[PDB]
Every structure is written in structure tokens, then in C-alpha cells.
Design a protein around this nucleic acid. Sequence first.
RNA 1: GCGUACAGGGAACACGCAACCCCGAAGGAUCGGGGAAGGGACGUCGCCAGGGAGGCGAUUCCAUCAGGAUGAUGACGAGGGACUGAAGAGUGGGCGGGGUAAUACCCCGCCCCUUUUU
Lengths: 55, 55, 55, 55
Amino acid sequence: MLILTRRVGETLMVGDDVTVTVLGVKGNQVRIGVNAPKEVAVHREEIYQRIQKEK
Amino acid sequence: MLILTRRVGETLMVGDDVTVTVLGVKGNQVRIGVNAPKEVAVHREEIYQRIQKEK
Amino acid sequence: MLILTRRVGETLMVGDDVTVTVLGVKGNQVRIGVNAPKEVAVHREEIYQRIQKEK
Amino acid sequence: MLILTRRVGETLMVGDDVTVTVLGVKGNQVRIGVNAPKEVAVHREEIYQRIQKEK
RNA sequence: GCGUACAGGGAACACGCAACCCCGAAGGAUCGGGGAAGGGACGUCGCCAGGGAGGCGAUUCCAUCAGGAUGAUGACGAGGGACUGAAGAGUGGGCGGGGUAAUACCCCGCCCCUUUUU
């Protein structure tokens, strides 16, 4: 429900040092790196969490 | 600490109530947003966390 | 003498290593660029080249 | 940030180095000719970076 | 997003119109301003109806591997010193050769133009 249209990098910052940042882009592919801390669970919403649900 | 290379249309939700994905690309600009609930506070840069730091 | 080469964009001449690439397109001309220093002097199509050949 | 754009009919640079010309145009692909001093180290991004990593 | 054609001193913007936001005003008359950034929009871009609807196409390098690392691998051609090269397709303009009572039309070779293979 949101849209912000960043340019270089602006954090996420819900209060747990999770920060979105655009690193690189060419063509139609965006290097988007997130320096979230290690205690939170990061994942790709794909076949990974699909087989996590289908464990 | 940075995991990246998500193509247009793909999603990268970390496994919680985040729902982060790319919303298209206008060349050198990015379209990015979430449908995270308003209980957690997602914001842009220091231009919108200086209100969070009261400065 | 007149060495020729090929690009789809993002050219390179070693030795300079800072600004060798203006290789974009919008139909007729060059478009892409990020940064360039003042230590690499430039001259357009005889523009200021004539005045530096004069005085 | 000192990004230029000139005519694709012909091109030149400052006088201490004899420099690039322009020959072809095909979409994003482009033929580049340079009237360069052969002796000066000139290379593209193919193998020379790897052999400099070797050296 | 649509565009436009630049201007030179070194500038991802140069301008217009859309797009966006906010304000005011007279209740057959719908008018005018201001800006360039905000937020909790399950988005942007196109269409279909009875006795006051519910619907349909929709992400565009088919790359290809994954993982706590300002990740990687690639993308027709490597040396280069060349108005480079190798191909493929098509357009017509042509030049010839064969077919063709003849004309018209069919096939083959070469030059130029557009497009495809980082």
C-alpha cells in the first residue's frame, strides 16, 4: 500500500536497525542490499519459504 | 550482510509482516513499497527520522 | 594510427581510468555519464580549441 | 557532475593527446574509432585487468 | 510519461505539456491561483452493464547460480592500429547470367540501405 521512489538509499528503520538500500541497477535488475541485523530472520519470498512451509 | 539481485516483479519479504517487492523501474529510478501494517513504522531518510530524533 | 573498436556502451581507455565513457543513446546522440574531474581538461568540436590555438 | 554530450558527426579533445573519432551507429551498438598515439597504453575491459591482477 | 530542439564552458538537466499535492471562490457558473515532494493507496497503463452491477488482459535481458558477503557468472569475435571484421534476414535502386515466341514474371552472383548476433 506504499510507494516512496528512492534514488540512492534510504533506510527502512522500524526501530531494529533494518535498512533497505539500493546498491546498483542496470537494465531491469536492481541490486537491493539490506543490512538487517543477524538476530532477525531474512528470507526471499520464493521457493525457499515455499519448501519451509512444505517441510 | 547484504543479499540482493531481485528482478522486476519478484518479491523479497523476509518472512514476517513486511511484504517488500519492487513495483517497476523507470530507468534510473526505482519503485519500491510495502504493505506492512502501521503498527511498525517504515520511513524514508534522515529527512523523515529527524522528527523521530526530534531534531 | 587510426585504431578502431566496438562498443554497445561502457567503453574504456586505460591510463586515464576516470572519464573515458560517454556512451548512451536516445536515438542520435550520447547520453550516459556519472562523474568527471577538472584534472581531465576537455574541448568540444573546436569550441575553445580555436581560442587555445590562438591564445 | 561534469557530464557532456556532443555531436556524433565528429569529435576531438584537448591538444596534447590526439583522440577519438566516431564512425557507426546501430541502436545501442556503436563503432568507435580513435586516432590515438599507438605507444600510449590503451585497452578495453577484457583481459588486461586480469593480467594486472596477475602482475 | 509524452515530447522538443539545444546551448556552451566543463552542467542527470535546458524548457513545454501531462502526472502530483494544496488553497480560495460565487450554489445553471464550475472558475482561478500556488508550488515541487509527500505517505500506511493491497499501484500504474486499457475495456465490458438494468430496472440503481459484478467482471477481463497486468512487468516486460525466457539470463542463471544461490544466501547474514558495499555476492558471482554472463552476455558474435580475440589480438588491436583497420572509414575494422565475420555472418543472417529484408527493402527497393541497380548491374550482369540463365529460364522466358516475345512482354510480363521465376531463379543465381555482386554493390548500396534498414535490422539482428556483447
